[PDB]
Design an enzyme around this catalytic site. Structure first.
Site, PDB file in Angstrom:
ATOM      1  N   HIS A 170       0.826  -1.202   0.000  1.00  0.00           N
ATOM      2  CA  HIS A 170       0.000   0.000   0.000  1.00  0.00           C
ATOM      3  C   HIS A 170       0.863   1.255   0.000  1.00  0.00           C
ATOM      4  CE1 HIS A 170      -3.593  -2.384   1.018  1.00  0.00           C
ATOM      5  NE2 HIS A 170      -2.714  -3.118   1.678  1.00  0.00           N
ATOM      6  N   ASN A 189      -9.463  -3.698   3.206  1.00  0.00           N
ATOM      7  CA  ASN A 189      -9.427  -3.579   1.774  1.00  0.00           C
ATOM      8  C   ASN A 189     -10.843  -3.471   1.190  1.00  0.00           C
ATOM      9  OD1 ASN A 189      -6.683  -4.034   1.928  1.00  0.00           O
ATOM     10  ND2 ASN A 189      -6.877  -6.221   1.452  1.00  0.00           N
TER      11      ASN A 189
HETATM   12  C1  HDD Z   1       2.810  -8.174   8.627  1.00  0.00           C
HETATM   13  C2  HDD Z   1       2.032  -8.744   7.730  1.00  0.00           C
HETATM   14  C3  HDD Z   1       0.869  -8.034   7.192  1.00  0.00           C
HETATM   15  C4  HDD Z   1      -0.418  -8.710   6.919  1.00  0.00           C
HETATM   16  C5  HDD Z   1      -0.709 -10.148   7.122  1.00  0.00           C
HETATM   17  C6  HDD Z   1      -1.191  -7.639   6.426  1.00  0.00           C
HETATM   18  N1  HDD Z   1      -0.556  -6.489   6.369  1.00  0.00           N
HETATM   19 FE1  HDD Z   1      -1.352  -4.648   5.726  1.00  0.00          FE
HETATM   20  N2  HDD Z   1       0.327  -3.774   6.090  1.00  0.00           N
HETATM   21  C7  HDD Z   1       1.446  -4.353   6.559  1.00  0.00           C
HETATM   22  C8  HDD Z   1       1.355  -5.560   6.789  1.00  0.00           C
HETATM   23  C9  HDD Z   1       0.674  -6.689   6.817  1.00  0.00           C
HETATM   24  C10 HDD Z   1       2.601  -3.388   6.733  1.00  0.00           C
HETATM   25  C11 HDD Z   1       3.857  -3.713   5.891  1.00  0.00           C
HETATM   26  O1  HDD Z   1       2.864  -3.393   8.124  1.00  0.00           O
HETATM   27  C12 HDD Z   1       2.019  -2.056   6.272  1.00  0.00           C
HETATM   28  C13 HDD Z   1       2.946  -1.469   5.194  1.00  0.00           C
HETATM   29  C14 HDD Z   1       3.410  -0.061   5.602  1.00  0.00           C
HETATM   30  C15 HDD Z   1       2.722   0.137   6.930  1.00  0.00           C
HETATM   31  O2  HDD Z   1       2.805   1.158   7.620  1.00  0.00           O
HETATM   32  O3  HDD Z   1       1.944  -1.041   7.285  1.00  0.00           O
HETATM   33  C16 HDD Z   1       0.586  -2.476   5.898  1.00  0.00           C
HETATM   34  C17 HDD Z   1      -0.376  -1.843   5.464  1.00  0.00           C
HETATM   35  C18 HDD Z   1      -1.604  -1.688   5.024  1.00  0.00           C
HETATM   36  C19 HDD Z   1      -2.351  -0.563   4.552  1.00  0.00           C
HETATM   37  C20 HDD Z   1      -2.029   0.880   4.300  1.00  0.00           C
HETATM   38  C21 HDD Z   1      -2.071   1.962   5.366  1.00  0.00           C
HETATM   39  C22 HDD Z   1      -2.662   3.089   4.547  1.00  0.00           C
HETATM   40  O4  HDD Z   1      -3.682   2.867   3.785  1.00  0.00           O
HETATM   41  O5  HDD Z   1      -2.106   4.201   4.654  1.00  0.00           O
HETATM   42  C23 HDD Z   1      -3.654  -1.184   4.242  1.00  0.00           C
HETATM   43  C24 HDD Z   1      -4.883  -0.530   3.716  1.00  0.00           C
HETATM   44  C25 HDD Z   1      -3.467  -2.611   4.597  1.00  0.00           C
HETATM   45  N3  HDD Z   1      -2.256  -2.859   5.068  1.00  0.00           N
HETATM   46  C26 HDD Z   1      -4.505  -3.577   4.491  1.00  0.00           C
HETATM   47  C27 HDD Z   1      -4.287  -4.958   4.873  1.00  0.00           C
HETATM   48  C28 HDD Z   1      -5.315  -5.864   4.743  1.00  0.00           C
HETATM   49  C29 HDD Z   1      -6.664  -5.512   4.254  1.00  0.00           C
HETATM   50  C30 HDD Z   1      -4.739  -7.150   5.187  1.00  0.00           C
HETATM   51  C31 HDD Z   1      -5.492  -8.418   5.233  1.00  0.00           C
HETATM   52  C32 HDD Z   1      -6.033  -8.843   4.105  1.00  0.00           C
HETATM   53  C33 HDD Z   1      -3.419  -6.816   5.509  1.00  0.00           C
HETATM   54  N4  HDD Z   1      -3.160  -5.538   5.290  1.00  0.00           N
HETATM   55  C34 HDD Z   1      -2.410  -7.485   5.995  1.00  0.00           C
END
Ligand code: HDD
Ligand code: HDD
Ligand code: HDD
EC number: 1.11.1.6
Lengths: 223, 256, 223, 256, 256, 223, 223, 256
Positions: A54, A127
């Site tokens: 994202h 999402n």
């Molecule tokens: C550690 C594993 C992990 C898992 C299993 C998931 N995520 Fe995630 N997600 C992250 C790890 C992560 C992250 C890498 O920690 C992020 C990336 C940058 C941040 O700050 O958080 C992130 C970010 C992030 C963001 C963006 C924040 C924004 O919009 O500014 C969204 C919308 C989602 N996620 C949605 C999901 C959804 C809907 C998941 C389930 C289907 C999901 N993520 C699972």
């Protein structure tokens, strides 16, 4: 709208912001030009790491209020009375591509909402489809690596349309459900304004008596 | 692709809508299930590759959200925003959904490099609007200058303030729901998660013939860009466990 | 092509890279799952800041050799004998957009060459037009901020086509020359293989006697 | 735009080219001007907004560079590479071109946050392939383990090694050309830099009628996307100090 | 205090001894308890404020460790070394000791700031000497250049290598012991940890009269430097629940 | 002095700040204990790098005013009227030893002061002897390395009494002047309250007519 | 021992490492002196954050071997054959004080061992007393803050002898056992060579059959 | 040494004084020298190894400074404060003192890793109290949320604000003194800095017989701790060029 003098960050008014200090107008730039190096330094350190996933997002401020006290099912303040107005900030995003990739790609989108309640920040991070690709968080990096540009050449940007993605999909049938949605028209929405949202996970609502209720979060667009 | 005409479309459409006045609105709804219906379904409630169908559990209208103000500075408010699902409040709680559980670890950990340290909360767009106080101290870019004589607890030098607060009906401290746990320490997928095709199928079956054509096009365009041919056939192959028509339509476009 | 065991980064063989450690198969995930957190941690810190400019690039290793000894004009080792092979790494780039932005945009192109000489690394960092937009380094941050996505909404990606850019051009006539090249067909080249390269600045060559000769660097594609 | 069809096109062509074996080739040539010819031109040599015309000083062919191997890992080798024009070697040197002078400060500074500190030259892609030894120590992610009893010079405990090396024909130490410098400490643009239009003119004048059409379209398309109208006019206005046809053609397309 | 004469005494003594050839030597010994004796003790085995008495469970001699080489550079080797108790190997495993449990989180998380990112294992002192391969990529200061066509698994494009390895007698994969877990989700200290005074008492009671003087002096000297007087008396008060002589002696020196 | 609830940094009231969440009072700690990780995370990341030199220090807030307008010799606001009060922050320090070394060592002392003028911050960074050890900044890293704990074993802390310092001194006679001071009793002052200060460098004062005057900065202790 | 040329980190031989580049031997330093800034830059970024605790340490390389195969009680490779030598690296430390604090303080000591096994790194990270101060990790930051210098003025270094520490002990009796040992003579040992070490926690040994045996780790000095 | 009784003595005394009320006072004084007297001295004004002797240029009382308030939080305020001599204001300016010149590069550079980015000015103790505005943006931990439509200049979209300010008697822009610079680019120490022993001997000669004994003791104590004997003798040798009695007193103590 408010006329101030241009300064260094130490608040020192700047006389000339079009030249470096040099020895003769045709001469070498002097190390003592602290105003230059301050401007450059800052410029030099402007960027920070983009999100792992994202990366690519758009955001806005807003507010929220409930239709009626939900006190019966949950003791959560922001939901306890229709007159309590909660501020919110909301970011919508794609998944795969970077900060400077395109909005209009075939991909899941994110829809995350920060609720500044009076009892703490509540983050609802979802999402635009009701399920996800994989079941255990341990597989996250494998999937994401598979969907993301491939390691040797960094291609493609914002596309599931290369080998690894489908190699992973073809050997991890749990993925098929979301992939379906991805290949649908939900995968190429035409605006955030007309997008659905899901919390995907089953969470719990806990009311004042400690009675647990399984919940799943939806956001429906009224546009 | 509008990816060529305007790579920023959606970003622009949202901002420009809010400018004009037509604020995007959303309704927050909950699907509720009583604790005792936990096992009453074709599938496991905690498996995130499964949806709860609306005809079994309806989505109950619960609130309205309105987006009325574009940020001032993109970087300062957008880029640096930190959302994390473990950020919940009393009244909510998690479940043993294994995707969710791991998520819980990551959004915290990833701020430390992304936003430069453990004081990202002091950044405007992430700062609570309610009071916050603990005994944490220091860290890169600490803005909060603490006067409290004590940085620990229990402490007597500041009459033990700030003090914890017991769980209550309102303004209560946070206490996890005491879910019973029983089982062995294991790295193992719950067998209840092991059915992959009937949700895909239910989804396809409920698409209008022209929506279905679109999904065939999606699969067909993507699979076509796959260089390794045997990958193509294994996907199509998987597609067959979903619905024979779909499988074939796609297979035809790729030559199998 | 060489068959190794899947391990943690500490070299510890992994047995099941498919599941978190939990209490029961339907249970919560245990903090003692050190394999998970290593995997997730590393994924969590995968990203690093992109370049401030020329974030978007493609590189390749190569080599260079001179046609004849230049010893007469410069005492630089890599140019002192046609039999001397110098390794090189080369990176081509756009200027404005991010790491995930498009290749094919109207923009200046970077053409950077790292020369691993026996007497040190020599980096020749040029663009694909023979001049720059501005005259003094001190305006860099201004011009760049102007050409970049605008600060309120971060639009557009990889395009000079917005106000701030032509606002600045308009008020800084110095920029017209390059702007000319940018609006040319050189601003939208069809491959790096067929691109020109210029170091832009006048540098000095210094020979074994201390004689200085002014120089400008050109790269001319033989494809 | 191929920005819609393939946003990776150039990246892709270069790679596939090298895979295939058609190794991109390039000729390095120098434009050379003796010291005394410094002021024999219409314009200032140290003005990075002016080109040296080839018919005045021809580009002399000097060597061939060949790109023959794609990297193995994009991030490791491509993303982490650090190029910087301050990185020159004995036989080369700078001038007072005030755009380059500033550059010299920035490519070093910007590595410290981007590559996470002052040991970035220890990352393989940046590592010299010749010897390097000095008295610098520590810093984040330090790989080199130093055995030298001394971390300073002069020192007698290691006989002063590594020692400096006086400048010479080959294998010498770096000394700067002793350019004479005369003037007052001033922030001020050299008046010799004061002419902005004739190079842009010379450029246009030597374009084929159909290249010129393209340039018009460029300006036209870009200016059309500017919202504030006056900016539009002011640009065209400048366009006018360059060549009347161009200014008008464009102006026609935007309607003035 | 030698803290005045030589603030580096210990650091110096260790180094100089190694220089000289008297390599410090250590015997690693285990206290072993079969699984079924888990509850046959006056105290809880998982309580890290309690010792297992040697006369109940003897310490079995198991190996010898010899320190025979000082590092070459202090910063590179010592300052950068990273120790973490979550770093175990097949044949070892943890327990629910709730201090060790939390410990498991911290030694990983703290590396990211202190050593600059998730590639800290790539620094020479921390690098395994056996093989290590996985699908992790990138992160700051990455040294390893990966040639594997795949960065995920399961993968078919590199035949799923590197592959997981099942648990076994030798050279096996790490499986956790399948410990049975049965409880509610609670933030609650185990009542078996509730006794605080008999281990202190057992300790004191086994000290020679002149060691016993020394303890008093320690308590007396430290409490003496305490400003707030009441803190003084509450400590002495707690001393009192340990042994009356001790409490008094110290009470005497501070005047109560 | 003002009673508040103990919370996470997200403002979420904590109930029990004496335990981790676990499965049963004698069971494993659960990864979903987000209050724990927050607490430990911040604890984990408490430290930042200490100053390269002058790591050891004590400071305090205060103020400054001039005896009479110096408008005649310098157009500097903070000196231009004896009624104008400038806030200051002042940091005293040793040189060699770390943040946690002893105060009471033979060593130069630093005397640095931050003047928050109404026309910018003015930092006057000085030591307690009227000269430094070396002439050209280029040698700094050399001299510092030589006085600092030696590279093989990291000894000694807060002492110039080892080979590398005196090796350097013996081959760099320039140092002898400040060495002298150091070996005097000014090298072991008994308090910051009775310490002199020096800006060491000759700086300039520029008055409103652009007349330049050479200046050197002295602090004298009135206690 | 092996004579090389002095260079930049880019491998460029240095001619004069005693002066900066200036305009005239009495002139100002030029920004273009790239040899300078590299040297200073490296020096400017020399320090990294110290350990949150046990910041003060001393370490050495060594080896280990078991007396006889322990395959009966554990399948751990490094303990499976007396002929198998495992390299080690061992760090001894204090707890409270910083990197530049003293050795000879009254404090617990750390005794940390890194075993480079053929089946992975095993770190056995102990102290010199058989128990710890607190029962749950969640309290760590509270206690550590208590013993550490106090927040307002950063006193004292390397001593438990101040209020907060004894405040905390007095209201958390659990600590009394380890406090006992600290005040003993074990809290002021005379060398690392004669020190005991303890893993403190009960861990598990797992054998080839899956039988679990509770264990506690001891180091006894043969000096 | 009080380094053994109290390692925190000075830190402690200073704080306790302010607590109690005896605020430390300091008189700022300027040695002043008209531009034209630049070369009237035994030595070079710009040589920072040389002091301007008071009996030639007296120290002019100019101000009083008072420390009246301990910080609230050591880390937040002391540790995180950032002092830099390049931080000057109109009315002050530098000279070509080559120690200071370099100093001017480092106090800025070092903050980037120490305080985690280029927004360290936004931390409270460093934040100016006057207005500060510019077109700088972003950077790790950004606090200021800029509302300016323009992040560049010259810009017409916010009337070019914030605007520059011309130099003036008061509230003026900063402009550097137009010092005339003449000479060649060279790395060479000015010959005027080449005399090392007379200020040292002027210093020694003005110490009371018992202050001189102290200096001998310092040198003697330090050199006695140097392991390599020839270093001792070389130093003492340099002491000789300063004053024979000193040299011999010290020599005697070390046996030469
Ligand atoms: C550690 C594993 C992990 C898992 C299993 C998931 N995520 Fe995630 N997600 C992250 C790890 C992560 C992250 C890498 O920690 C992020 C990336 C940058 C941040 O700050 O958080 C992130 C970010 C992030 C963001 C963006 C924040 C924004 O919009 O500014 C969204 C919308 C989602 N996620 C949605 C999901 C959804 C809907 C998941 C389930 C289907 C999901 N993520 C699972
Ligand atoms: C001092 C400010 C400044 C100025 C006046 C210039 N640059 Fe620059 N340039 C930077 C500042 C900078 C930078 C911020 O330092 C970059 C961005 C990221 C990086 O590592 O260096 C960079 C990068 C960068 C790259 C990317 C190299 C790579 O990593 O592949 C190229 C090709 C150029 N520049 C080319 C130029 C040319 C042809 C200039 C005018 C002749 C010029 N730059 C001026
Ligand atoms: C070229 C490098 C360099 C040179 C020649 C000097 N310094 Fe420096 N100084 C630094 C580099 C540096 C530094 C590495 O940048 C420090 C350490 C941490 C920091 O932020 O700045 C610093 C700090 C520092 C501090 C700490 C300020 C504080 O208490 O917060 C004082 C008091 C001085 N210096 C005093 C001097 C004096 C009197 C010098 C004249 C010889 C001098 N320095 C030269």
């Amino acid at each position: 709208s408010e006329n101030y003098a241009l300064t260094t960050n130490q608040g020192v008014r700047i006389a000339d912001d079009q030249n470096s200090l040099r020895a003769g107008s045709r001469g070498p730039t002097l190390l003592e030009d602290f105003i230059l190096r301050e401007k450059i330094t800052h410029f030099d350190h402007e960027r920070i790491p983009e999100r792992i996933v994202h990366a690519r997002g758009s955001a806005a401020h807003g507010y929220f209020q409930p239709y009626k006290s939900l006190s019966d099912i949950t003791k959560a303040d922001f939901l306890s009375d229709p007159n309590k107005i909660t501020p919110v900030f909301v970011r919508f995003s794609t998944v795969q591509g970077g900060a400077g990739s395109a909005d209009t790609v075939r991909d899941i989108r994110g829809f995350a909402t920060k609720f500044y309640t009076e009892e703490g920040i509540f983050d609802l991070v979802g999402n635009n489809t009701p399920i996800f690709f994989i079941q255990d968080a341990h597989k996250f990096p494998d999937f994401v690596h598979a969907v993301k540009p491939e390691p040797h050449w960094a291609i493609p940007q914002g596309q599931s349309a290369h080998d690894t993605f489908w190699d992973y999909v073809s050997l991890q049938p749990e993925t098929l459900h979301n992939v379906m949605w991805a290949m649908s028209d939900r995968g190429i929405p035409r605006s955030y304004r007309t997008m659905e949202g899901f919390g995907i996970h089953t969470f719990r609502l806990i009311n004042a008596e400690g009675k647990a209720t399984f919940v799943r979060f939806h956001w429906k667009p009224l546009a | 692709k509008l990816t060529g005409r305007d790579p920023d479309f959606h970003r622009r459409e949202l901002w420009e809508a809010i400018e004009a006045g037509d604020f995007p609105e959303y309704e927050l709804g909950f699907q509720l299930i009583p604790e005792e219906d936990e096992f009453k379904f074709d599938f496991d409630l905690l498996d995130p590759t499964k949806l709860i169908p609306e005809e079994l559990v309806p989505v109950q209208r619960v609130g309205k959200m309105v987006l009325n103000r574009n940020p001032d500075n993109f970087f300062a408010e957008n880029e640096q925003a930190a959302f994390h699902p473990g950020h919940i409040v009393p009244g909510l709680d998690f479940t043993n959904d294994p995707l969710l559980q791991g998520r819980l670890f990551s959004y915290t950990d990833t701020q430390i490099s992304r936003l430069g340290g453990p004081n990202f909360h002091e950044i405007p767009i992430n700062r609570p609007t309610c009071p916050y106080h603990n005994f944490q101290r220091d860290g890169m870019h600490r803005m909060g200058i603490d006067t409290n004589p004590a940085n620990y607890e229990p402490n007597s030098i500041n009459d033990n303030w700030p003090r914890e607060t017991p769980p209550g009906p309102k303004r209560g401290g946070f206490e996890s729901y005491q879910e019973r746990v029983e089982g062995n320490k294991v790295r193992e997928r719950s067998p209840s998660f092991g059915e992959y095709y009937s949700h895909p199928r239910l989804f396809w079956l409920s698409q209008t013939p022209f929506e279905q054509r679109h999904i065939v096009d999606g699969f067909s365009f993507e699979l076509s860009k796959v260089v390794r041919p045997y990958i193509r056939e294994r996907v199509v192959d998987q597609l067959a466990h979903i619905d024979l028509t779909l499988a074939q339509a796609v297979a035809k476009n790729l030559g199998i």
